[PDB]
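pls ignore typos typing on phone
zinc ion + seq
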Amino acid sequence: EVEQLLQFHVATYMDNDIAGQPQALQKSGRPVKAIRARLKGKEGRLRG
Amino acid sequence: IKQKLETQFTCLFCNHDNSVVCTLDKKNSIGLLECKKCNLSFQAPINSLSQPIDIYSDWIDACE
Amino acid sequence: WEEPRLILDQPAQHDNINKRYEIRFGKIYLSRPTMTEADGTTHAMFPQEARLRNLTYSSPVYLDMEKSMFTSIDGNKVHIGKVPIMLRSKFCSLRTLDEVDLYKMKECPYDMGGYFVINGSEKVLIAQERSAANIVQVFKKAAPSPISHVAEIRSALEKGSRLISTMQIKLYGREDKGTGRTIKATLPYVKQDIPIVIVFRALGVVPDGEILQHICYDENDWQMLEMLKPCIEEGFVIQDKEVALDFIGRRGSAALGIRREKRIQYAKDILQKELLPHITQEEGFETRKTFFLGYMVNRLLLCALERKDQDDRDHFGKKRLDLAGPLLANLFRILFRKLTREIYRYMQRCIETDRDFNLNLAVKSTTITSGLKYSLATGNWGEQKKAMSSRAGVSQVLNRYTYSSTLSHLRRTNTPIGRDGKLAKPRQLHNTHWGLVCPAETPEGQACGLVKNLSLLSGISIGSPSEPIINFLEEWGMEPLEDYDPAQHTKSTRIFVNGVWTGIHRDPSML
Amino acid sequence: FGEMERDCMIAHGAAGFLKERLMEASDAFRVHVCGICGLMSVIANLKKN
Amino acid sequence: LIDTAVKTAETGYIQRRLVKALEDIMVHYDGTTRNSLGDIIQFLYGED
Amino acid sequence: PQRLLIPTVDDPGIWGVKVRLGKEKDVVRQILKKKLAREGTKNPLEIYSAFQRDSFKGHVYIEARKAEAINDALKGNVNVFSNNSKFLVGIVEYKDLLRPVKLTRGSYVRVKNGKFKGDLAQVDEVLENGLEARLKLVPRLDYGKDLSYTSKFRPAQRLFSEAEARVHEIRRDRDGFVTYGGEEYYEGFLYKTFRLQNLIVNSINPTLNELSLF
Amino acid sequence: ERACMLCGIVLPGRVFMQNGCPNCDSVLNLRDSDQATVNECTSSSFEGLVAVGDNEHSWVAKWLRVDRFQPGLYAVRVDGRLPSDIVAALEQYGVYYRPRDG
RNA sequence: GCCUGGUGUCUUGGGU
DNA sequence: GGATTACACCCAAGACACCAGGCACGAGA
DNA sequence: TCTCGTGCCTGGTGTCTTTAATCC
Ligand SMILES: [Zn+2]
Ligand SMILES: [Zn+2]
Ligand SMILES: [Zn+2]
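k done
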């Protein structure tokens, strides 16, 4: 249970849009802004 | 064609979970439960609509 | 009174002494809005002070609670929170006063109210458009699907008016593809589609000849009878009630191993309640559900036989507007359960000390007060921790740029379909909008055609009890459902009251 | 200066103008790279040279 | 009003994909039309 | 000898069960109530024991002979995850589940509470009963400068200066020992009693600043 | 709640004052003590809550050496040790104290 | 006696 | 039976963690 | 003067069950 949780945190640190499992959440309730989400979409590093 | 399916049911005898395999032969309307652990076997009739939960239910009533 | 009592139990062996702890909620009382300073002093709050000092114009709510203590060897006015008051309503301190004294309270006589004040900011509730409950709608399905026609209904109770469940009846089989063209249904909390005949048998009506007598009321219609042919044969081997009910229970999302002796008794709940709960939920009334089920299948086949067009989803008679009243009740319902569980979780610790709890220490008014304030201030319709998936934009800051804009803003309606989904059907001005929503007033841009505005003479139904209507229908000749036979009644008219088939009358013209 | 304005300057063939807009007139930055491994891992003390 | 508001985004997407497909195509000094890989798209621009 | 009490194949099985975090003690309690209430009836709860280890968050362990008894113990318990998540423990793993597990005068500890939270302190002595320890601490004082404290609005650390106290605001008790504002300072250090549970004795990492000072 | 240092049982502290320890009070006499005595023989600090339902057939109970005691809540680890004067008095009674603090 | 930092993430309403 | 796609720019107003445990201070006996 | 209760601040840690079309 503890090793899988280290795998989990390292995964959602890089990509928090993994299909088929719940997103990592901030205490405010909104999803964590992972590095992958920083680069994609209209406002990310590349298009924005 | 026969269907060989693994299930997450607990064997009623050896109590090992996730070790019951269901073989449903619809051509002859014969369903077969098998235990991958203690090796027991149970046969029951199946229709066309049946699923591993249908014969596993019949196995619970066949014991009690 | 939706969940009127809380109940605990312990089988005292520590001389067994069952000690049920029970708490009953009684009458509600309301007080006029009051400002309580940090001092402790109180006074009547009027809106002008509330705007200036960024306060919330709200009324304290008190609830009678009653304790009782069963013991077998074998309170008063507790404060539950503050509810924001709509200005100029019957519970606002401005409703009286009279024109002379309005000027002294710095209130303008042209201000017609209809809005709330939350942290000094004026918030108006936007009417939410939804589909009607308890009505059957038939739609056609796209080509790459084995289904061609679907009947759908969302069932919702009359009391409260709240959603319960949703149910579908799908007709499989494409055009010359799909072989046996049978019909299966979808039931709440069951993982797989179940053929129609099986659920008919599972309700207590088992021989074929009675089943077809409940659906088709025209023995000559061989086209319709030919389409029900494969449904009989695919559910022939299920020849009695018991094996039918068990076939259901073996799919209904439960645990593995509840045996036939009980797996029936679990499925009987999924049939008695959750399946069509708007008709009835008391026992021994399964004749109404069986008759209604036959009506659905009849309507399904009329569309598949091209004798009736599919329903028009935009027909305004199939639509409802949720205004301030219904919207608050749904939110208050969610929050009152949250307050309830916090009381229940608190009793299990405070009774292990065996100390009489002072009640006022077991009601945290922050649950309702912060809940209502947060949702009205942000528009997020739900619990704060679940801000996504909840609907946004229900509350908006009241536009005060000009007088005309205030009138329009208080009469606005919203359809919550999205910006995802192009096409045109919810955006078009449909013919049935005539005289009910404005044909001209609509925003430019992304909301165009989805946000609408009530015509000048429109009104919204407040709601009325259906019970006096039933009494009037039976007094003037309506005959019960147990007396009805398609061979004898091959011509009479069916009567619906809020979507439940309640009777039949042979001479509708006088009625 | 969005994506569509970028395309217009390409069509004009004004390559020099486009470079300046997106660098000198904005967020131009100087970095040091290693000629061997190509990474920006250089530690550069400019007063000690 | 609905059509103008809807179909403006349809054609806006069309223009974006067209530009990215074609942005690197340049006339070179030998008259050929080539992309950034030096693939020949036309041996002579516009055939004239 | 403890070695004669090791488990064997004849002993009951032990299953672990996942429960809501922080609710492990509650579940153990609830299981005991159910067991005791059903003793001697026709349907006894056929578990022998249940327990929860702090080091093992979110788990309860239950001792029985049949898996069905585990399901019986947890039935209706609102703190237990409904998924059929119990797991079997091996006999060779049993005793480690029940392993029960410092502080010496003259050694260093780190304080866990109060204005001295995070500060390094020497253990001077412990109470006869064995609960609180007298600590030698670099004080964080103001000499009553703004009188008419928290860890976020405290003072810098500096040895007590009795002449500064004499000048500005004090009881002499012995050679180099003063009581100042009802605390004791000996040769510049505060000597103050702390609960042993209020100090950290393990894995202390001296800081740069502490290496400079001590 | 406190835990008896001798037997490990977990009870509300006042119980140790009212009734003594149900396992130990024949030798510990906490029922007839003052609070200082109760607090020297029972600890507010303990870890590893154990429901023992069947002392005499539980392996868990045998390992924790509570197999001869009464069904109840016990602690795997009890912090503190019995005062040397009480240990000496117990030994006069033929009772051997095996500390439960680890 | 030169240097000189004031937020973000959303949502909603608008303009062409 | 799965995601990815869904014009551009701009303006402005309107908002923000919860629960439990421990320690300290004040009041009452 | 001592003990108990209440309030405030700081630190640590989640969970009752409840929009639509395309290709690859
Ligand atoms: Zn087996
Ligand atoms: Zn390098
Ligand atoms: Zn004891």
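Residues 8-13, 15-16 of chain E lie near DNA strand I (CB under 10 Å from a C1'). The helical segments of chain E are 2-22. more later
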